[PDB]
Each structure stands twice: as structure tokens, then as C-alpha cells.
Design a protein around this ligand. Structure first.
Ligand code: GNP
Ligand code: QTS
Ligand code: MG
Ligand code: NA
Lengths: 469, 167, 166
């Protein structure tokens, strides 16, 4: 039969399951709702491990349990009482013999050791992947160090000593490919001549490669702590979501730079070369699976200042019109084709983050924190699982690095790009629209002519890579 | 077959804007939602006896992607311009949202409604008279909605569809 | 996108975690932090088909030896890992093979035999002895280095192909 459990009066996690404390979804069970005690019981269950549940719980628990209270609860979970000797053990002891202790030994092997090990696995995941709780609360860290450092007994010793070392390393805190990255490509601007770097003088292949490295690094830096609780939308967003906001502000600045390059090129023929070059960069973004970059370009082409430039669009070569149209169709029908393409490509890639943000926000806003059942309020865990499914998808695409070499000067050029200068947003985007009206006036105003501004050749070197020995 | 209206929700972030479409599209009577579900933003409705399909774009959460607003806005035939009645800044933002919609659509007469949203129990700071005066100055309807009781939600969307039909 | 549940098993310290993290992140873990149970996901195109690998990284330490049935029930294929400089880890392979067969009640479970740490010169298990064992199981044998990446994709993606053809 099943193992007997400690009395629920001395050990709270032995209370029987009921609809008043846990609800399952319709082959391990999936929890729809439960009390925090039942969630922690199942987080550290003696019958099975649930590593996805550990990630889901540690990512989302702060919406229903404070970090200090979580630590108290898992320490309480860890301290399991052992059963008393049975009648057969008693009779052996009364005869001076050693008891078999069959039930005690089974309870240690099949209940205490698995639960305790799974408590330690929660601690290990907490420290390794959610260390910000301890960075923000030094006393919480002290309590965790004390708990781990005072676990006795040889069965847990290997993991206790390991977790102690992991904590110490995390307090004071390399990529291998077997193929070489391709050679860095140069066009008009030559290596070290950063003062000539510009949209048309850097090689369009290398523009796309270095922006992809930059945008990949920015994408990979965003942690779930910046997302759960919708904190990037709230008043403290600069404090709680700095890596996400840096990533978005890069994307915005690049889009505005593309628009600015276009509408400040007043000569029609030169402006066609600028737009064609940007579409070539978009083609390389597509080849690199940099979907953020693809949409940076598409957003620029759909902006009010650029979208209305019919004379410019008319002269774009047909094959580039088709490249731009295909990229635009990724966003149609609520990103239907983008979502399918993201799920089909071979990473590395750079996802577009905005869809994730909308889905996290709407999941949090559209589902209640608790479910009321039989007079009790149960934590709505299904809502947290949905949020963690999104943060898990984000994290899955953060693992794979790009096999591309950094060019430090080109990287710095794009890190320092500042198309708006000291201007506020409205002043700047009104400027861009007024430039658009200047260079291609509204009908029936005639189209003026403008002098050339570039002294170097406008012919693109193309976007197929070269390879000398 | 039936007419499809492409509606776009615009307005300041962080003040409960997303509750408007969630409460509309929702199972009205079960507070639950999966936004990842294909067509969680499409709803067949009957307005003045005529059946139509609403396709609602609400990019709530993407407000910092400010250079994408033009692209998102151009997809729409009618617009809900949403502010929170306890956030004066979000009300002051309305003028620039409307100007941007007019530019993107290249029209001075774009179907739109002004929506004042009650997203919590914090003190109201925009009185309804202020918002009515603003809507009248623009020639557009004003609807107030609750983010919690679903009051006003149908009226906001149906009024906008009537603005499209009567354009 | 088809989903595949892979499980990495073998004696403590043979490199199950280093192999998995090299696959997932292209990074070699120098530290020896004994695993309790970890899980990873990887989208990857294999033979032109996109799939999603769920990779369960398990405990090799003997103190966790009573907790294995639960993960063997869920896994669809198993990487059975030993280290080519540790004869005891090779002798431990057959215990894992027999337990997997018992739990899944099947003689036909997708598996790959993996001899890890092949970057080290001081080998104590010869390739022939491991190959003989793999043939007796009907499964391929792949030598790997989590340090250099040699054989790493081959080991995991061969296991995927065996699940796909199962
Ligand atoms: N030279 C070399 N060292 C390796 C290789 N794989 C792992 N190691 C080293 O061997 C040690 C143990 O690796 P680890 O991945 O933790 O082994 P494990 O099988 O997961 N251990 P456990 O079962 O306790 O979780 C580490 O110091 C690691 O760097 C390899 O291919 N080559
Ligand atoms: N006609 C057209 N097809 C598009 C597809 C996707 C994005 C924008 C698109 N435009 C407008 C446009 C693009 C570029 C220039 Cl330079 C001038 C207008
Ligand atoms: Mg390990
Ligand atoms: Na206010």
C-alpha cells in the first residue's frame, strides 16, 4: 500500500488533496489552481520531478508569494519528521535484536530523500536562474546561505556543498563553433576610417551583420524579471526593465535613422539608391533570421514620411519591390506569417519582441489572480503557466549565438547612432514629414529637382558574400 | 459575405487600455483569456440588425516601439483613442494620437471615438465635461467604459462601427 | 513542428550536463556541479524538418538512483553516456539500459551509446569494446567531446532520427 505520511498537524504538506486546496486541469497532472502550500508540495513532489513546473513557479511566484515567505515555506517543506518504530520493530527491540525498520527505511528512500532533493533543486534553480531576488535582498541571501550551509547528513552532502559553491560564485559574478565566421566585408569606407562610415559607404552585408550581432546581444540580455508583472509598462519601468527598454530604443532609433537617410536625400536618383540599399540590408537580415531587423526596415518603409514617396517607389527595381512586399506580408493578419516563419527557421535568430510583450500583458490583464471555490481563494496557477510559456519561448531563442565576427568600429558607429539629436520626438518626426513634403510635394504641386549630395559612387556592391583565400 | 471592420485601439500604456478589447472579445461571462489563440481579436456581432465581423488590433504593451505606430495605424478603418480617467497625461496625449491618425490615413475625417477608461478605483482626474468638450471640438463621440464591469465596452465599439458606416 | 523528448543518462561526472549545455549554448562548462534534474528546449532543423527538442538532463550521483522511473516513463529516447577515461562509468551503462527497458516495458527503445571526453588522450575504454556493446543493443555508438564539440550534434541528432523512425 501507499506510504503513511506525517500527521498534517505537525507537517502541513501532508494534508489530503481536495477541491478546497487544489484543482487540476482535465502523464503527470497539470495544476489549474491551488493554495500556496499545495503548489509548493507539488513543486517538490515525492512521486515525480517537474522541471518545467520549477521554472514556471520560480519565474512567476512573486505575484502570489513574497521571496522571504517562499524560502520559509520550502525550509518547512524540507524538515520532514521520521515515523516512529512499528509494532514489529518494537518487538525486536524488546528482545534485544536490531529492528528491520522496513517502513522507516522505505519512507526515507521514497518520501524524505526525493522531497528533500527536490527542495534543493528549487534552491539550485532559484540561485542559478533567478538570482535577482538575492541581489535585491541581502538578508534573503544570508538566509539561503545559512539554510544550505546547515543541511546535515550524507545523502544530500554532494548537492549542499555544490550549491554553497554556486552561491559564492554567483555573488562575485565563452563560445565555441567548429566553423569559422565569414570574413568581414568592406566597401567605400576602409578599416579604421570611422569618420567616413555611413549607410552607403559601409558594405551592406556588413551593416546587416553588425546590426544583427548588436540586436542579438540586446535580445539575449532581457531577463524574465523585466517582463513578469507587466513591469515594463509601469511607472518604474526604467528601474525594472532596463535591458528591454534599451533593446526597443535601439530598434526605434534604427527605424528613424532609415527614415532620415531617405528623406534627407533630396535628389530623386540618389534617394532611390538609398532605398535600394536599405532593401538590400533587409535581404541580409532575412538571410540571418534577424526578424527584429526585418521589421525595423519595414516599419521605416511604412512610416508616414516614406510611405507617400510614390516617385521613389516607382523606380525601385521589381525584384526589390518583391523583397519588401514579402517582408511586409510577415506582419499582416496579426503577424500570421511571421509567427509561422519564426517556428520553422533554424536558429540563431533575433525575434521581434513586441508580440511577446502584448501577449504577456494581455495574459496578465485578462485572467484573475485567484479562483474562488468552496469559500476558498485559490491561486490561479494556469495564468502563471501561460505567462511562463511565453518567457520560456523567449529564453529558447536566447541560447544560440551567431557565428559572425564583431567589427568594433562598425559596432560603435551603430551603438552611437542618434538620428534625433537633441530634438524631442514630435519635433523630429514633424521635421521628417516636412522633408517628405519638400522632396515630393502633394499633387498637384509639381515635382522639383534637387542637387546631388553624395560625391562617391552610388552603385551597390551587392549582398552576395565574397571569399578570397 | 458579411462586412469586416478593421478597428485599431490607440492610447497611452500602463493604464489599463487592454481591458477594453479583452472585455469585448472575452467570453463575456467567464473572466479568462488566451491572447495567443488565433482569432482572439475577431468577433462576429450584430449592430443595428446588420451582422458584421470586427477585427481589432490592440498592440497594448508595445508603446515604446514608437516608430511602428504609423505602420500599425495604417491597417485601420476606425480608431478608438483611449485615455484613463485617472491619468491626465494620457488624456493630454489624445491630441497627438488624433493628429498622427489623420496624417497616416491622409484624411481630416477619419472614423474615431474618444474613450475614457476607468481602470481602477484611484481618484478620477479627468472630468467627463472636459472629455466631452474635447470630443465635441473634434466632432467625434465620447464613451466612458469600466475596465472591470464591462460597462460602456459594447457602446464604444458599436459607436465606432456606426461612425464607419455613416462616413 | 514535432516535439521530441530526449533524456541524457549515465554515471556521475561523465559529462551529461556539459554535453547538453554545449548543444544548447555552444559553451563548455568547466565546473562539476552535480545535477538533480534540469530541462532544456531547442528548436532545430534536422534533415530539413523543424523540431523542438525537450532535453532532460538527469542525476548521475548514486544518491539519486531511486528517482529514475519517473523520467524514464516520459522520455522518448535516451543518450546513454559514459566517459572513455572511466571504466566504471562504462560498466554502469548496462544498468541504465536494463532499467529503461524495464520501465518502458520494451526491447525497442530509441537509444544512442555515447563515449564522452574523447579530447582526452588517456583513454581506458577502447572504442571496440564500446562498439561491441552498442551492436549487442542494436544502437549506434558516437564518441563526443563537450569541450571541443566533436560528435555532439551527431549524438543528439542521431537520437532524434531514431525517435522519428520508431
Ligand atoms: N575534458 C573534458 N572534460 C569534460 C567533458 N565533459 C565534461 N567534462 C568535465 O567533467 C566534469 C563533469 O561534467 P558534468 O557535465 O558536470 O558531468 P555530469 O555527468 O553532468 N555529472 P552529474 O551526473 O553529477 O550531473 C566537469 O569538470 C566538466 O568540465 C569533455 O568532453 N571533455
Ligand atoms: N508601395 C509600397 N509597398 C510597400 C510594401 C511594404 C512597405 C511599404 C510599401 N510601400 C510604400 C513605399 C515604400 C518605399 C518607398 Cl521609397 C515609398 C513608398
Ligand atoms: Mg550533470
Ligand atoms: Na493624473
Amino acid at each position: 500500500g501507499q506510504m503513511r505520511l506525517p500527521s498534517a498537524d505537525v507537517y502541513r504538506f501532508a494534508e489530503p488533496d481536495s477541491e478546497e486546496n487544489i484543482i487540476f486541469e482535465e502523464g503527470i497532472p497539470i495544476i489549474k489552481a491551488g493554495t500556496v502550500i499545495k503548489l509548493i508540495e507539488r513543486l517538490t513532489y515525492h512521486m515525480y520531478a517537474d522541471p518545467n513546473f520549477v521554472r514556471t513557479f520560480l519565474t512567476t511566484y512573486r505575484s502570489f508569494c513574497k521571496p522571504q515567505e517562499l524560502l520559509s515555506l520550502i525550509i518547512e517543506r524540507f524538515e520532514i519528521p521520521e515515523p516512529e518504530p512499528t509494532e514489529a520493530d518494537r518487538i525486536a527491540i524488546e528482545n534485544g535484536d536490531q529492528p528491520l525498520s522496513a517502513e522507516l527505511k522505505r519512507f526515507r528512500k521514497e518520501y524524505i530523500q526525493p522531497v528533500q532533493l527536490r527542495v534543493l533543486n528549487v534552491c539550485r534553480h532559484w540561485v542559478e536562474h533567478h538570482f535577482y531576488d538575492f541581489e535585491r535582498d541581502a538578508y534573503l541571501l544570508q538566509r539561503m546561505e545559512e539554510f544550505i550551509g546547515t543541511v546535515r547528513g550524507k545523502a544530500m552532502k554532494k548537492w549542499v556543498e555544490s550549491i554553497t559553491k554556486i552561491i559564492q560564485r554567483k555573488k562575485i559574478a565563452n563560445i565555441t563553433f567548429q566553423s569559422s565566421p565569414p570574413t568581414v566585408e568592406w566597401h567605400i569606407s576602409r578599416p579604421g576610417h570611422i569618420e567616413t562610415f555611413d549607410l552607403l559607404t559601409l558594405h551592406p552585408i556588413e551593416i546587416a551583420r553588425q546590426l544583427t550581432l548588436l540586436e542579438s546581444d540586446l535580445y539575449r540580455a532581457v531577463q524574465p524579471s523585466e517582463l513578469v508583472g507587466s513591469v515594463w509598462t509601469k511607472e518604474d519601468k526604467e528601474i525594472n526593465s532596463p535591458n528591454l527598454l534599451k533593446m526597443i530604443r535601439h530598434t526605434t532609433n534604427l527605424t528613424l535613422w532609415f527614415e532620415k537617410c531617405i528623406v534627407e536625400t533630396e535628389n530623386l536618383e540618389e534617394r532611390v539608391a538609398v532605398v535600394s540599399r536599405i532593401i538590400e540590408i533587409l535581404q541580409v537580415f532575412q538571410e540571418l533570421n534577424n526578424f527584429n531587423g526585418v521589421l525595423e526596415v519595414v516599419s521605416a518603409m511604412n512610416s508616414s514620411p516614406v510611405y507617400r514617396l510614390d516617385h521613389t517607389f516607382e523606380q525601385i527595381p521589381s525584384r526589390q519591390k518583391k523583397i519588401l512586399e514579402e517582408a511586409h506580408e510577415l506582419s499582416e493578419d496579426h503577424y500570421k506569417k511571421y509567427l509561422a516563419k519564426l517556428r520553422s527557421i533554424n536558429p540563431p535568430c533575433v525575434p521581434f519582441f513586441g508580440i511577446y510583450l502584448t501577449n504577456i500583458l494581455k495574459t496578465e490583464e485578462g485572467n484573475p489572480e485567484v479562483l474562488k471555490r468552496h469559500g476558498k481563494e485559490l491561486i490561479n496557477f494556469s495564468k502563471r503557466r501561460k505567462v511562463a510559456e511565453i518567457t520560456g519561448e523567449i529564453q529558447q531563442y536566447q541560447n544560440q549565438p551567431y557565428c559572425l565576427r564583431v567589427e568594433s568600429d562598425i559596432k560603435r558607429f551603430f551603438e552611437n547612432l542618434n538620428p534625433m539629436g537633441n530634438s524631442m520626438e514630435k519635433e523630429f518626426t514633424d521635421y521628417l514629414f516636412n522633408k517628405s513634403l519638400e522632396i515630393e510635394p502633394r499633387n498637384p504641386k509639381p515635382l522639383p529637382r534637387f542637387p546631388k549630395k553624395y560625391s562617391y559612387p552610388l552603385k551597390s556592391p551587392g549582398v552576395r558574400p565574397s571569399n578570397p583565400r | 459575405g458579411m462586412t469586416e471592420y478593421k478597428l485599431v485601439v490607440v492610447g497611452a500604456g500602463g493604464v489599463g487600455k487592454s481591458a477594453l478589447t479583452i472585455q469585448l472579445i472575452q467570453n463575456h461571462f467567464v473572466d479568462e483569456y488566451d491572447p495567443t489563440i488565433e482569432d482572439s481579436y475577431r468577433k462576429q456581432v450584430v449592430i443595428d440588425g446588420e451582422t458584421c465581423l470586427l477585427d481589432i488590433l490592440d498592440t497594448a504593451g508595445q508603446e515604446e516601439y514608437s516608430a511602428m505606430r504609423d505602420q500599425y495605424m495604417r491597417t485601420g478603418e476606425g480608431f478608438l483613442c483611449v485615455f484613463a480617467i485617472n491619468n491626465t497625461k494620457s488624456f493630454e496625449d489624445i491630441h497627438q494620437y488624433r493628429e498622427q491618425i489623420k496624417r497616416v490615413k491622409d484624411s481630416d475625417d477619419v472614423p474615431m471615438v474618444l474613450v475614457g477608461n476607468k481602470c481602477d478605483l484611484a481618484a478620477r482626474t479627468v472630468e467627463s465635461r472636459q472629455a466631452q468638450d474635447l470630443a465635441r471640438s473634434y466632432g467625434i463621440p465620447y464613451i466612458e467604459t469600466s475596465a472591470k464591469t464591462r460597462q460602456g465596452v459594447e457602446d464604444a465599439f458599436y459607436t465606432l462601427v456606426r461612425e464607419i458606416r455613416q462616413h
